Design an enzyme around this catalytic site. Structure first.
Site, short mmCIF file in Angstrom:
data_model
loop_
_atom_site.label_atom_id
_atom_site.label_comp_id
_atom_site.label_asym_id
_atom_site.label_seq_id
_atom_site.Cartn_x
_atom_site.Cartn_y
_atom_site.Cartn_z
N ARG A 1 0.85 -1.19 0.00
CA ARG A 1 0.00 0.00 0.00
C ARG A 1 0.88 1.24 0.00
N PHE B 1 0.74 10.10 2.65
CA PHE B 1 -0.02 9.58 3.78
C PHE B 1 0.67 8.40 4.44
N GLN C 1 2.75 1.30 3.56
CA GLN C 1 2.56 0.09 4.35
C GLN C 1 2.91 -1.13 3.51
N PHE D 1 4.41 0.02 8.48
CA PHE D 1 3.90 1.18 7.76
C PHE D 1 4.72 2.40 8.14
N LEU E 1 -3.61 7.85 13.42
CA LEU E 1 -2.84 6.63 13.61
C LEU E 1 -2.18 6.55 14.98
N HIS F 1 -1.73 2.13 16.54
CA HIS F 1 -0.53 1.32 16.31
C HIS F 1 0.65 1.95 17.03
#
Lengths: 61, 124, 149, 33, 224, 169
Positions: free
Chosen positions: F59, F64, F67, F117, F126, F130
Site C-alpha cells: 500500500r 499519507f 505500508q 507502515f 494513527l 498502532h
C-alpha cells in the site's frame, strides 16, 4: 582483440584474500566490521559466511 | 595464583621444557594421559613423573596424585592451564593429569632425569 | 600453615591456644623472638609481620622485598633481624630504628636458610644456588662463599 | 592470558584457543554442503 | 606461549594446504596462465601413453620421456639445492653455535681427579670444552687434580658423563652449582707443586673455597 | 544503544538506495525483537531465516503512508511475528506525528505482525491505534520516492517496490 579482461585480477584478489588473517571470533568479526562500517550480518547470513564476507571485504583495503 | 592448594606449581620458564618433554614422549609413545592412567602407572611403579593442571575446579579429584607420588617417591609438578597440557599431550581435549613411564635404553633418559632433578629442587 | 594462620599451642593441650590471623598467602617462616614477647611471621606475599604475646596486634609489617620473604633470622641480642626473600635479596632490618642495614646480595636463587651466628658479627645465609655466603656485621662484606652441597 | 596461534602466529586469548583450533581449521569445502 | 596442535589436525591442515594448492593450480590452468599438465609418463607407461606414436620413431619417443624424467629429477634436485642453505651456513654458525644459553647463570662443576698425568685425557678434556664453549680451569698438584668447569647447563651435562663415564685414580664432582658471573677465563693449565701457589691463583678469581674443599676431601679419604 | 537496521529499496528493479531505520527498543522491546527476525530470520520455518527480506510495500498512499512488509501473503494481509502469531502493542507513548516513523501496521488491537507502515506525514488518527516500531534515521529520499510511486486501485503500486536486501546495521 583487446584484453578487456580483469578476471585475472579476480583470481589474484582471491589468492591474496585466501592468505589473509581473519579472527575466528565473531566479536572481533563484528568489531572489525564496525571499524570499517559493514553490517553485523545480512538476512540469513550465518557465522561462517559472516567470516567469509569479512575476508572478502578486507581483501580490498 | 588461581589455586592456593598448589605446592609444586611451576612458573612459565620450565613449563616450556615440560611441555617439550611431554610432546617428545608422545612422539616416542612414552606417556599415559588422564588421571586414571597416571594413577595406574603410579600403582604399577613404572611412572617416572606425572604433571597435572591447577585449572580443574575440584582439585581434590587430582589431589590424590601428589600423595601417591609421595608414597612411591615420584616427582610431581603442576601447570597453569589444563588446555595447554592437554594439547601438548597430543589430544585436543583438556587433560588435567598425564604420566611419563619408563623405557629401556630411552633416548629421553637424560631429559627426563633433568626434569626430575629440576622439580625435586622446587618443592620448598 | 599454608592458610596464613598462625597457631600457638601449649605443651599440654592438643588444641592451639592462640589463632593469629591476618594473612591470606601461605606463611613461609614463623620464628619467635629470643626474648619471647615478639613474633616475626614472614609470608610469601612479600611481607613480614610482627605480633606480640601481650597485645596480639600487627607491630611491624616489614615490606621491601620484591618477592616473598621465605626465611627470617633475628639476632641473638634482638637488635637486628635478617630477612631473606625469594628475589636473592636479604635485608638486615634494625629492631631499634626500623630501617635496613645490610643488603645480603650475591646469590642466584632464593635464600632458603638464614640463621645469625651467636658470635654477634657473623651471619651465614645458604641459598638455593648450592652455596652459602658468610657476611660480617663489622666488615660489612662477604666473608666466604662455601660450596656446601 | 595470551597464547600463540599455531596456524596464524598471532596473540590469542587463552580462553578461546580450544574452539579457536576447532574453528580456525574449518574445512573450506564444508561450507558448500 | 604457543600450543602444539595434535597429529589429527596436523593431517587435517596438511590436507587443507594441499587441496588449496591443487584447486588454485586447477583454477589457474582453467584460466590458462600455464599449459594443461602434460601426462607424467615413465618407461612402464611409454607404450601405454605414446605407444601408437612411439612405433614410428621409438628412439625419439624414449628420448622425450627420458627428457621428461630428467626434467622432473632436475626440478627435485635444484629445489633441494635452493632449499639447501643450512647445510653449510647453519652447519656450524646457525646449526651448532648455541652456547647453551649461558647468559643469566653459569653452571660450575668442580671435579677432583686423583691421577691426570695422561696428556691424552687432558687434551680431549680441553678439546671437549672448546667445541662446547665452556670455560674452565685446571690446577695440577701432588695426587690432587682439581678441575673447575664453568659453562652452560647443556655443556655441564655433557661434560659430567665425559669425566665420570667416558674418561678414567678416580674423579668425583665435589661441588655442582651456579654463579652470578663468570670467574675463570679460558681453559688453561698451570702446575702447582705447593698448595700455596694453587691457593694464591685460586684467590685471584675468588675460587679458594674450591681448592679448600678438594684439599679437605683428599685428606678425609686417607683416614678410612 | 538502540538497534539500527538497513533495508535496500528496489522499486521497479531499480535500487533507490538503502534505508537505515533504527528500532526503538526502549519503548518497544517486542517490536525491536521482531524487527530482528524481519532484518534476519532464523529457523523460522524448518530452519529457514524467514523475515522482511523479499517483501514489498503493498500500500502506497502518497504523502499519507507506505505500508507493506508482508512476507506471508504479500498484499498486506500476512501477519507473522516472533511470538508465534500476532502480538499486542508495546506502548502508546510513541506517536505518528513525525514523518518517516515506521509503525507496526495492523488491522486492529493486538494484530501487529510483519506488516510495517512508514508514515509519510503527521497522522493524528494513527496515534494510539498502532505503536511506532522505529524511526528512519537515514534513507528519507528512498522513502519519499516509494511514497510517490504510482498507485493503482486500493493504493496498489503498479511498479514492483520490494526490498532486495535487509539486515542489521
Amino acid at each position: 582483440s583487446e584484453r578487456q579482461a580483469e578476471v585475472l585480477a579476480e583470481f589474484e584478489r582471491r589468492k591474496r584474500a585466501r592468505q589473509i588473517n581473519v579472527s575466528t571470533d565473531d566479536s572481533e568479526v563484528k568489531a572489525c566490521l564496525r571499524a570499517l562500517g559493514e553490517p553485523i550480518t545480512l538476512f540469513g547470513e550465518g557465522p561462517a559466511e559472516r567470516r567469509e564476507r569479512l575476508r572478502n571485504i578486507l581483501s580490498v583495503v | 595464583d588461581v589455586n592456593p592448594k598448589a605446592y609444586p606449581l611451576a612458573d612459565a620458564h620450565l613449563t616450556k621444557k615440560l611441555l617439550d618433554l611431554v610432546q617428545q614422549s608422545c612422539n616416542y609413545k612414552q606417556l599415559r594421559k588422564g588421571a586414571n592412567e597416571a594413577t595406574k602407572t603410579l600403582n604399577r611403579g613404572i611412572s617416572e613423573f606425572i604433571v597435572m593442571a591447577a585449572d580443574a575446579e575440584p582439585l581434590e579429584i587430582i589431589l590424590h596424585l601428589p600423595l601417591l607420588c609421595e608414597d612411591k617417591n615420584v616427582p610431581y609438578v603442576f601447570v597453569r592451564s589444563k588446555q595447554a597440557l592437554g594439547r601438548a599431550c597430543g589430544v585436543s581435549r583438556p587433560v588435567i593429569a598425564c604420566s611419563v613411564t619408563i623405557k629401556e635404553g630411552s633416548q629421553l633418559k637424560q631429559q627426563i632425569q633433568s626434569i626430575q632433578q629440576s622439580i625435586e629442587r622446587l618443592l620448598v | 600453615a599454608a592458610d596464613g594462620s598462625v597457631k600457638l599451642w601449649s605443651l599440654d593441650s592438643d588444641e592451639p591456644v592462640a589463632d593469629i590471623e591476618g594473612h591470606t598467602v601461605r606463611v613461609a617462616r614463623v620464628m619467635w623472638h629470643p626474648s619471647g614477647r615478639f613474633l616475626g611471621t614472614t609470608c610469601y606475599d612479600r611481607s613480614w609481620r610482627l605480633w606480640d604475646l601481650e597485645a596480639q596486634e600487627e607491630i611491624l609489617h616489614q615490606e621491601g622485598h620484591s618477592m616473598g620473604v621465605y626465611d627470617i633470622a633475628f639476632h641473638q641480642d634482638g637488635s637486628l633481624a635478617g630477612t631473606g626473600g625469594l628475589d636473592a635479596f636479604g635485608r638486615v632490618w634494625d629492631l631499634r630504628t626500623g630501617r635496613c642495614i645490610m643488603f645480603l646480595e650475591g646469590h642466584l636463587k632464593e635464600i632458603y636458610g638464614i640463621n645469625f651466628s651467636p658470635n654477634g658479627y657473623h651471619i651465614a645465609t645458604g641459598s638455593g644456588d648450592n652455596t652459602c655466603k658468610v657476611w660480617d656485621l663489622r666488615q660489612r662484606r662477604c666473608v666466604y662463599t662455601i660450596p656446601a652441597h | 592470558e595470551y597464547l600463540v596461534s599455531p596456524i596464524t602466529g598471532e596473540k590469542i586469548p587463552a580462553s578461546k584457543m580450544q574452539e579457536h583450533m576447532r574453528i580456525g581449521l574449518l574445512d573450506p569445502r564444508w561450507l558448500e554442503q | 606461549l604457543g600450543v602444539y596442535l595434535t597429529k589429527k589436525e596436523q593431517k587435517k591442515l596438511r590436507r587443507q594446504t594441499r587441496r588449496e594448492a591443487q584447486k588454485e593450480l586447477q583454477e589457474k590452468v582453467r584460466l590458462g596462465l600455464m599449459p594443461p599438465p602434460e601426462p607424467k609418463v615413465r618407461i612402464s607407461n611409454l607404450m601405454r601413453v605414446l605407444g601408437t606414436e612411439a612405433v614410428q620413431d621409438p628412439t625419439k619417443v624414449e628420448a622425450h620421456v627420458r627428457a621428461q624424467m630428467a626434467k622432473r629429477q632436475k626440478a627435485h634436485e635444484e629445489a633441494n639445492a635452493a632449499r639447501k642453505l643450512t647445510a653449510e651456513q647453519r652447519k656450524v654458525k646457525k646449526i651448532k653455535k648455541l652456547k647453551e644459553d649461558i647468559s643469566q647463570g653459569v653452571h660450575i662443576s668442580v671435579y677432583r681427579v686423583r691421577n691426570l698425568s695422561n696428556p691424552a685425557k687432558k687434551f680431549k678434556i680441553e678439546a671437549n670444552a672448546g667445541q662446547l664453549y665452556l670455560t674452565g680451569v685446571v690446577v695440577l698438584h701432588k695426587d690432587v687434580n682439581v678441575v673447575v668447569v664453568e659453562g652452560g647447563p647443556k655443556a655441564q651435562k655433557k661434560f659430567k658423563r665425559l669425566m665420570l663415564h667416558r674418561i678414567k685414580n678416580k674423579c668425583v664432582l665435589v661441588w655442582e652449582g651456579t654463579a652470578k658471573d663468570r670467574s675463570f677465563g679460558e681453559m688453561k693449565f698451570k702446575q702447582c707443586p705447593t698448595e700455596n701457589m694453587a691457593r694464591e691463583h685460586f684467590k685471584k678469581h675468588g675460587a679458594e673455597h674450591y681448592w679448600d674443599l678438594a684439599l679437605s676431601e683428599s685428606v678425609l679419604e686417607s683416614t678410612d | 544503544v538502540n538497534p539500527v537496521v538497513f533495508f535496500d529499496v528496489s522499486i521497479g528493479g531499480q535500487e533507490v538506495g538503502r534505508m537505515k531505520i533504527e528500532l526503538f527498543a526502549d519503548v518497544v522491546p517486542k517490536t525491536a525483537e521482531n524487527f530482528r527476525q524481519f532484518c534476519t530470520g532464523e529457523f523460522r520455518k524448518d530452519g529457514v531465516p524467514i523475515g522482511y527480506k523479499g517483501s514489498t510495500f503493498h500500500r502506497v498512499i502518497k504523502d499519507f503512508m507506505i505500508q507493506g512488509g508482508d512476507f506471508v501473503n504479500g498484499d498486506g494481509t500476512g501477519v507473522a511475528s516472533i511470538y508465534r502469531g500476532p502480538f499486542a502493542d508495546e506502548n502508546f507513548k510513541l506517536r505518528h506525528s513525525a514523518p518517516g516513523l515506521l509503525s507496526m501496521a495492523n488491522s486492529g488491537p493486538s494484530t501487529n505482525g510483519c506488516q510495517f507502515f512508514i508514515t509519510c506525514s503527521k497522522c493524528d488518527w494513527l496515534d494510539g491505534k498502532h505503536v511506532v516500531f522505529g524511526k528512519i534515521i537515514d534513507g528519507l529520499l528512498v522513502m519519499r520516492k516509494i511514497e510517490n510511486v504510482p498507485t493503482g486501485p486500493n493504493n496498489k503500486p503498479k511498479l514492483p517496490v520490494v526490498i532486495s536486501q535487509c539486515g542489521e546495521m
